[PDB]
């Protein structure tokens, strides 16, 4: 889940 968001950065 964290990675799914972190792609934004
Ligand atoms: C949420 O974005 C997210 C994405 C990917 C993963 C995840 C956990 C573990 C592996 C892995 O290769 O584990 C080897 C033990 C890959 N991806 N978790 C949360
Ligand atoms: N928000 N994330 C990024 O902007 C981001 C872009 C690219 C990469 C990345 C990581 C690792 C490789 C590699 N070839 O091992 C390439 N690009 N990370 C984050
Ligand atoms: C951070 C990241 C790695 C692999 C695939 C996705 C969608 C995101
Ligand atoms: C982010 C990442 C690196 C290496 C291997 C996996 C499955 C995921
Ligand atoms: C915004 C964010 C949360 C967790 C992990 C990373 C790399 C970024
Ligand atoms: C407020 C906000 C928007 C997009 C992405 C993040 C990590 C935060
Ligand atoms: C270019 C940029 C916008 C927002 C957040 C970061 C870390 C960089």
Coordinates of C-alpha atoms and ligand atoms in Angstrom, one line a residue:
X1 CA 0.0 0.0 0.0
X2 CA 2.7 2.5 1.0
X3 CA 4.5 1.8 -2.4
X4 CA 1.3 2.3 -4.3
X5 CA 1.2 5.9 -3.0
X6 CA 5.0 6.5 -3.0
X7 CA 5.2 6.1 -6.8
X8 CA 3.9 9.7 -6.8
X9 CA 7.3 10.7 -5.6
Ligands
LIG1 C1 1.7 -1.4 -1.1 O1 1.9 -0.5 -1.9 C2 2.6 -2.6 -1.0 C3 3.2 -2.9 -2.2 C4 4.1 -4.0 -2.3 C5 4.3 -4.7 -1.1 C6 5.3 -5.8 -1.3 C7 5.7 -6.5 -0.1 C8 6.6 -7.5 -0.2 C9 7.2 -7.7 -1.4 C10 8.3 -8.8 -1.5 O2 8.9 -9.1 -2.4 O3 8.4 -9.5 -0.2 C11 9.4 -10.5 -0.3 C12 9.2 -11.2 1.1 C13 6.9 -7.0 -2.5 N1 5.9 -6.1 -2.4 N2 3.8 -4.4 0.0 C14 2.9 -3.4 0.1
LIG2 N1 8.2 8.9 -7.0 N2 9.2 8.1 -7.4 C1 10.1 8.4 -8.4 O1 10.1 9.5 -8.9 C2 11.1 7.3 -8.7 C3 11.5 7.2 -10.1 C4 12.3 6.2 -10.4 C5 12.8 5.4 -9.4 C6 13.8 4.3 -9.8 C7 14.2 3.4 -8.8 C8 15.1 2.4 -9.2 C9 15.5 2.3 -10.5 C10 16.4 1.2 -10.8 N3 16.7 1.0 -12.1 O2 16.8 0.4 -9.9 C11 15.0 3.2 -11.4 N4 14.2 4.2 -11.1 N5 12.4 5.5 -8.1 C12 11.6 6.5 -7.8
LIG3 C1 6.6 1.9 -6.3 C2 6.1 0.9 -7.3 C3 6.9 -0.2 -7.7 C4 6.3 -1.1 -8.6 C5 5.1 -0.9 -9.1 C6 4.3 0.2 -8.7 C7 2.9 0.5 -9.2 C8 4.8 1.1 -7.8
LIG4 C1 10.5 -3.0 -4.8 C2 11.0 -4.4 -5.1 C3 12.3 -4.7 -5.2 C4 12.8 -6.0 -5.5 C5 11.9 -7.0 -5.5 C6 10.5 -6.8 -5.3 C7 9.5 -7.9 -5.4 C8 10.1 -5.5 -5.1
LIG5 C1 5.0 9.3 1.1 C2 5.8 8.0 1.4 C3 5.3 7.2 2.4 C4 6.0 6.0 2.7 C5 7.2 5.7 2.1 C6 7.6 6.5 1.1 C7 8.9 6.2 0.3 C8 6.9 7.7 0.8
LIG6 C1 -1.5 15.9 0.3 C2 -0.9 14.8 -0.5 C3 -1.2 14.7 -1.8 C4 -0.6 13.7 -2.6 C5 0.3 12.9 -2.1 C6 0.7 13.0 -0.8 C7 1.8 12.1 -0.2 C8 0.1 14.0 0.0
LIG7 C1 9.0 18.3 -7.4 C2 8.4 17.8 -6.1 C3 7.1 18.1 -5.8 C4 6.5 17.7 -4.6 C5 7.2 17.0 -3.7 C6 8.6 16.6 -4.0 C7 9.4 15.8 -3.0 C8 9.1 17.1 -5.2

